[PDB]
Amino acid sequence: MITAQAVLYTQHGEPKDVLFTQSFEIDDDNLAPNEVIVKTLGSPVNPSDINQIQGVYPSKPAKTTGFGTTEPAAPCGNEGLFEVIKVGSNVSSLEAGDWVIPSHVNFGTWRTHALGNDDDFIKLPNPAQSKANGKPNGLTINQGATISVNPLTAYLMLTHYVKLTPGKDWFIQNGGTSAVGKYASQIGKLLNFNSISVIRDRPNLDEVVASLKELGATQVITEDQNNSREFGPTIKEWIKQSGGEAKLALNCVGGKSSTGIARKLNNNGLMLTYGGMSFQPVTIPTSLYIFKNFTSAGFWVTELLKNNKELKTSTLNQIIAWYEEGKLTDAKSIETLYDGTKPLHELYQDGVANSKDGKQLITY
Amino acid sequence: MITAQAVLYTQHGEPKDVLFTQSFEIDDDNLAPNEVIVKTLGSPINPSDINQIQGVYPSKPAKTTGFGTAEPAAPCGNEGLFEVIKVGSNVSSLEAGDWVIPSHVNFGTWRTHALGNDDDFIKLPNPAQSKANGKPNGLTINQGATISVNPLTAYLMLTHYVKLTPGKDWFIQNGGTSAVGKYASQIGKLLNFNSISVIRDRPNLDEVVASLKELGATQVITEDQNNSKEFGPTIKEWIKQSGGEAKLALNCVGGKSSTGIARKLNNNGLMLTYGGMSFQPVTIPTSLYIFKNFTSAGFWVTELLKNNKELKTSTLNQIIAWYEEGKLTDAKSIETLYDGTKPLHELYQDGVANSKDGKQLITY
Numbered sequence A: 001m002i003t004a005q006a007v008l009y010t011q012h013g014e015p016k017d018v019l020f021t022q023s024f025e026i027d028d029d030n031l032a033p034n035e036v037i038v039k040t041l042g043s044p045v046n047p048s049d050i051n052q053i054q055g056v057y058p059s060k061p062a063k064t065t066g067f068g069t070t071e072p073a074a075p076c077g078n079e080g081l082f083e084v085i086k087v088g089s090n091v092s093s094l095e096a097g098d099w100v101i102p103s104h105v106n107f108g109t110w111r112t113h114a115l116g117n118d119d120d121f122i123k124l125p126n127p128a129q130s131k132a133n134g135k136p137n138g139l140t141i142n143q144g145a146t147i148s149v150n151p152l153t154a155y156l157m158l159t160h161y162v163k164l165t166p167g168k169d170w171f172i173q174n175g176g177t178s179a180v181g182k183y184a185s186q187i188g189k190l191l192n193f194n195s196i197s198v199i200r201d202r203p204n205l206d207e208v209v210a211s212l213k214e215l216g217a218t219q220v221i222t223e224d225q226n227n228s229r230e231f232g233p234t235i236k237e238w239i240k241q242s243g244g245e246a247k248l249a250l251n252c253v254g255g256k257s258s259t260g261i262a263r264k265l266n267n268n269g270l271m272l273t274y275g276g277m278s279f280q281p282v283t284i285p286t287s288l289y290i291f292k293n294f295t296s297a298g299f300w301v302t303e304l305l306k307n308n309k310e311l312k313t314s315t316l317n318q319i320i321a322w323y324e325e326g327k328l329t330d331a332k333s334i335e336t337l338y339d340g341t342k343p344l345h346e347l348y349q350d351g352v353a354n355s356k357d358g359k360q361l362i363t364y
Numbered sequence B: 001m002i003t004a005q006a007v008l009y010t011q012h013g014e015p016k017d018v019l020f021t022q023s024f025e026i027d028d029d030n031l032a033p034n035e036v037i038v039k040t041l042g043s044p045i046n047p048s049d050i051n052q053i054q055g056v057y058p059s060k061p062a063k064t065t066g067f068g069t070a071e072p073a074a075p076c077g078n079e080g081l082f083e084v085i086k087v088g089s090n091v092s093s094l095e096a097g098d099w100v101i102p103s104h105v106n107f108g109t110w111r112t113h114a115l116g117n118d119d120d121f122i123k124l125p126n127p128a129q130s131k132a133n134g135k136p137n138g139l140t141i142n143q144g145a146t147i148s149v150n151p152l153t154a155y156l157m158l159t160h161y162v163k164l165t166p167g168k169d170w171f172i173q174n175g176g177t178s179a180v181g182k183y184a185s186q187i188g189k190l191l192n193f194n195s196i197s198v199i200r201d202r203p204n205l206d207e208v209v210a211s212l213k214e215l216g217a218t219q220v221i222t223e224d225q226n227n228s229k230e231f232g233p234t235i236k237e238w239i240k241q242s243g244g245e246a247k248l249a250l251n252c253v254g255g256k257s258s259t260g261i262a263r264k265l266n267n268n269g270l271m272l273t274y275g276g277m278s279f280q281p282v283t284i285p286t287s288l289y290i291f292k293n294f295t296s297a298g299f300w301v302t303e304l305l306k307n308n309k310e311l312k313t314s315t316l317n318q319i320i321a322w323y324e325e326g327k328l329t330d331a332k333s334i335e336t337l338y339d340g341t342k343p344l345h346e347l348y349q350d351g352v353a354n355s356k357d358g359k360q361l362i363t364y
């Protein structure tokens, strides 16, 4: 028998208040024929995971007593990389040593182990398999553990809604230092799209601007520049020189930031709102709608891919291939290793509290 | 001392999610004068038990800490057969070895043992007692465990409301393959009432028709036939040939099915609704109320027998006698035995999930 740990809550609220660790038992002897046991290698903290715990995210796992609690409790985390440790006698899709992610949301990835079927998982090539299949690179644990939400989100927003002419057209995005922002910049570079990333000013501004330009942002501006009527004509010059148009805006901030990036689009522009990193609503001047034919819409990768498994597979395959080819790198995570001395839920609580420092990955 | 197990929940929800098993101690060396300890022999899973756990049934046991839980918890199950194992110094009505059912609802029968007062139980004859009293049969465990709700429901609906003339009048009922339905057909035969059972179509329709007819249904029709304008005159022919009238409809379905059985009654008809599938409301054409003196009412055995021990006693005694005489038969339960190797709540969760296979009885 394996003794596992899961991060659970019995009631919605802030992670600092409601999370605890539950020890539970998994039977790793005498597997059913289709069953698969996996050990976690790592799982990140994404905003969606936190919103799920807070109760403001309408897709969530059921509260159950299945982890051996008396009160119904929900697990946490939708994304993660797991190593297959044992498979049942009718399992050929997976074997010991294989890398997998969950095939569906609401799996509960903030935990040490899981028992499911082979259809609960999607296989990723492990480094040994990538090299054997003649690839110059294999995935890292961070790359595998964060492959499923943010890279697909960036890829689909940039490709699935409006067609940007390679070598000419632009997108503009706020939250430029976000993991999603960093994938968008790289995917923009790979597809030959011009882009403007908007970021908050900070003391190490120059270092950040350089990182983002290296990733693929054509220009990086601050939110102060975004707000600036004086600066607008400079952006117009860039776009005019390119021969192209700013056709797409990606908004994960809301408020004034959403106003600023919308104003920078050419007529007939599209904005996709995929997040709201301050509680501020999407705010658009009436004149953009009426006089510039602006359109504002939403994006939600979970809903988009629900009955679109071909689209999911195709997108994921492209990200894997790019990683194997050395053409894509990961939005880097701050890693915290679980080793048994500090309760698992506290690692995640610290991760939630240190969100501002950057993407957090709990490792195992 | 006795280490017992109870199936409990701290919060309402689906049985698959909220049930757990709680160990608790009964001190069998510390009985008060009027107290009795019983060992469960068997308890079924009925829809009302499930609705209770889900939180949509307005009669339910209180949540308490009495089973030694940290948080308040409620037990499950309303019906069951128990064996008296020990009685207090002032108990005369029961002795060790006796068979009993709960005297009242909300007792919590999904558990191994209970401590209660002598008046929390009603004695049934055990097989040794039936045999000693000159009876050709004694009750089976399934018969005793399911005697409290369904048989009594059928008998009272048939006899307590409208007086059917033996050898000529008719009742019509839907849910004809239900436990209640099957008891009603038998009681109809025993009292010489004609009846029409309405059932859903199924692959072995003809085989089921024949079984229901053997039980006592005069005629059996599908829901399609119940709906059918074409078929309706055939039913009128049956009733006219008998010299009697259709005076009573028993409804456990609602919706179109309820409309159809109501339309088949003669003037001055009474419908009793005792259940309802798919949340479909009871739907009765206005014309029947106005022009055919139709009445529609409810039946709930829990409420009818709440303050009427004498009617309960007389009815229960008739059912017992019929079992002893070999005049009534139960539908075959699927029995799952608790031996202490699989948690008790999981046996009941399986039974809930497997409801469609047949009535589920957990035995001990």
Ligand SMILES: *O([C]1[C]([O])[C]([C]OP([O])(=O)OP(=O)([O-])O[C][C]2O[C]([N+]3=[C][C]=[C]C(C([N])=O)=[C]3)[C]([O])[C]2[O])O[C]1N1[C]=NC2=C1N=[C]N=C2[N])P([O])([O])=O
Pocket (backbone or CB within 6 Å): A046, A047, A048, A149, A150, A153, A175, A176, A177, A178, A179, A180, A181, A199, A200, A252, A253, A257, A273, A274, A275, A276, A277, A278, A299, A300, A301, A302, A355, A356, A358, A359
């Ligand atoms: O500015 C902040 C960061 O740029 C950014 C957050 O970065 P992150 O890496 O921690 O978060 P990500 O995992 O990339 O994603 C966060 C947002 O995107 C939404 N999202 C992601 C994927 C899929 C969906 C979807 N709909 O399919 C949605 C998610 O809900 C998040 O909203 O935020 C910036 N930030 C923080 N506070 C800000 C702010 N910008 C402006 N104003 C305020 N108050 P930094 O680098 O710290 O300065």
Ligand SMILES: NC(=O)c1ccc[n+]([C@@H]2O[C@H](COP(=O)([O-])OP(=O)(O)OC[C@H]3O[C@@H](n4cnc5c(N)ncnc54)[C@H](OP(=O)(O)O)[C@@H]3O)[C@@H](O)[C@H]2O)c1
Pocket (backbone or CB within 6 Å): B046, B047, B048, B149, B150, B153, B175, B176, B177, B178, B179, B180, B181, B200, B252, B253, B273, B274, B275, B276, B277, B278, B299, B300, B301, B302, B359
């Ligand atoms: N008010 C009361 O005093 C009281 C007391 C006892 C029972 N009841 C009611 O009676 C019913 C269950 O009694 P039971 O223990 O006899 O149950 P049961 O043995 O499990 O039988 C259930 C019946 O419901 C039928 N059914 C299921 N879904 C249906 C649907 N969608 N449309 C039409 N019929 C459907 C089944 O038909 P199939 O065989 O085709 O699947 C079967 O005949 C419940 O509605 C319950 O609330 C009420």
